[PDB]
Structures are given as C-alpha cells and as structure tokens.
Amino acid sequence: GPSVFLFPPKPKDTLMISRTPEVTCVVVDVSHEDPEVKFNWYVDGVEVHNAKTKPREEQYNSTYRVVSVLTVLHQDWLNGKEYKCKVSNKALPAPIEKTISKAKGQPREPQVYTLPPSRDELTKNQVSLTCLVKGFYPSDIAVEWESNGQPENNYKTTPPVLDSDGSFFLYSKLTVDKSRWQQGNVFSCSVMHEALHNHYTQKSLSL
C-alpha cells in the first residue's frame, strides 16, 4: 500500500526571483509486485505537463521510491494556486491524490523590533540579542542575523506561533560574546516576508 507525501517550496524560494520554487511529490512503500507509477499533476484543476520525474530508487526495505518535482511560478504561489499530485499504481484500488498551496488569508506586514539584552544578562559570559517579528500572515517567513554585512550563525529561530489576532509571531535569539556587545557594535535582524516592500526589511540594534 503506497503512500504519497507532498511538500511546499521553501519560504525564501518565492520571495525573490533569484531562486526557483519547487513542489516535490514523493511515493514510498511501492510494492515489488507492481512497481509502475504514473504522475498526474494539476494546478487549479487543469492538468500541467512540465513535471520532471526522476527514476525509481529501491530503498533498503525492498520498497521503491519515485519522486516527481514541478517548478512553480513565484507569483502563482503567492496568488494561492492549488497544486495537485495524482499517483496511480496497480496495487492501489483508487489513485492517491494530494493537494497543497499557500495558506489562505490576506497578507499582513510584519513588525520588526530589536530588543537590547536584559540588565541581568550583562554579568554572564554571553549576551542574548532578541528580534521580535509579529503580525505577519502567513507563517512562511525567514529571519537572519548579520553584522557589518557578515552573517551571524549562533542564532535559533522559534517556530511561528499563532497569535491571538489570527496572525503569527516568532522570536529569533542571537547569542554573542559579552566583549563584542560592549564595544558599541551594531547588529542587524534581517526579515524577508511577502508582505514587506521588496520582500525584505532589517533593523539595527546597538548599545
């Protein structure tokens, strides 16, 4: 009994035309008795025929895996067009269908706020710098840290929590050594979201 899994493009892939958003349809538990699989793709009902399906790979449980990837348009995804993957197999009484698209709802511009560290944390070895992004819809977002054009990598981004007013919020905490923050250095919190102008914004944070 095969099962089908569908995945959305990464949030950054759609916010800039420099990248290529894609939707991947994965089939697992492909029986050895009947390993033939056909992929039918549909976008808002009408069938599309520009899908690039890779040949099957046998897994270690003697079950094959077929993967079909369809490259989508940036504006089509941001306009909320449903993508449907149809998988047919001789071992399936009925074909399996999976649909995916952007979450419905009017886009909402996120608010970016940078918080200087608490006074209590000025005694410890390292100092936490926090960035608050709130009110953005949908949850597809990307937050990054850098200083003087150089990325910072000791940070963790929280999952988008559903706020009380139907919107989303999250926190991105950057961990830095004490000495760096004491020198009056400037750090920037970079946020990319579809409701922001040019799908990008940043705010500085210094002593």
Added chain:
Amino acid sequence: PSVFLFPPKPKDTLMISRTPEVTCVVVDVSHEDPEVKFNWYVDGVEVHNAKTKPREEQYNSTYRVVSVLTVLHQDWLNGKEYKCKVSNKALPAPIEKTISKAKGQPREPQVYTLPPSRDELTKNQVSLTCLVKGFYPSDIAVEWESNGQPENNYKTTPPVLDSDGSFFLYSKLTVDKSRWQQGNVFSCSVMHEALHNHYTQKSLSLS
C-alpha cells in the same frame, strides 16, 4: 486501532496540588469489535489505578477509548517508565507503548524580562517579552501576572533546542500603551524542577 501515549502536563508535576494523569489513547476503534482492554505496567510491575473513560462517537464512524492513570509527582520526576497495553479481537498482538521523562541533568533556567522597542511606542499597544533559556528538560510552564492577578493576554512560544543542548523559549504579553506608561509592574512566572521551590519570577516596569 492506533495506540498513542502522552506525558503529564509540565505544570502538573511541579505542584503537589495537581494530578499528573498520564493518558493512553486508542483511536480507530473497531466498529463491530468491542471491549478494548487496558493494562498498565510501571517499570515492569503491573498497576491497576486506571480510569477508562467511556467512548465517544466520531464523524468518520471510528470511536475513541481513553484510559487515564494518575502517577506520583516524584515518580515521573525520577524517570519511572509507564507502559499501556491494549488488546482486542481485531488486534493479533498486544500492541504496547512506553513513555518516560527526558533523560539528562536538569539545568536552572534564566529568566529575563525585556521592554518593548522604542519603535513600538507609537502603536496602540506594547508587547512585553520574557526570555527563558538554558533549561532542561523541555517540560516547563510560563505564566504572566500583574499585581497579584493573572494577565492572560499572552502567547508562549514552544521550546527550542539551543546550541548547547539546553532549551529556550519566549512569552509575549500584550498590554495597552496607557498601562505601561503609568509604571505598572508586570511579573513573568516560570516553573521548572531545576528552580528552588519549582518557581521563580522577574518583574518589569517603566523606569
């Protein structure tokens, strides 16, 4: 006939006035096959303190049976395991399931209260920030109180594994800009086993 187990709520075990109540769930019950059985084993030894709630009726014609067992607070904190066993006339084997608290040395959380950014002053409301970090396990509970009464207009982020192996999160309490300008004091309460008396709190006020 799927078996699912869930741990007690993190706040239940930290207060002796509550009940942990480990929950065992059996979904996709067989329509014609009745009498879902239940048995419990604690560290191997069988116990009989279960509360088998009467079943419900779901929309897809698959009812649910839940068995409830209350455990000792220290037993869960000491890491004792719990095993729920099920049987039926549609189940060939007695499918089991075991759950225990996360293994590892508990670490004391650090509580930091952060003020709203200067850019957020121009809005009708301001968002308070409480930073909890460096705690393990992820089982924790965060609340907000102001002048002896509970503020409930807040959302708490899920725990996130940090780079050192500890967890962290945030909680955002939203209050009207009028209240914050007066000088009202707001407290962030954190409950964890690694804290003395399983409780600590930090205040936050305009000054």
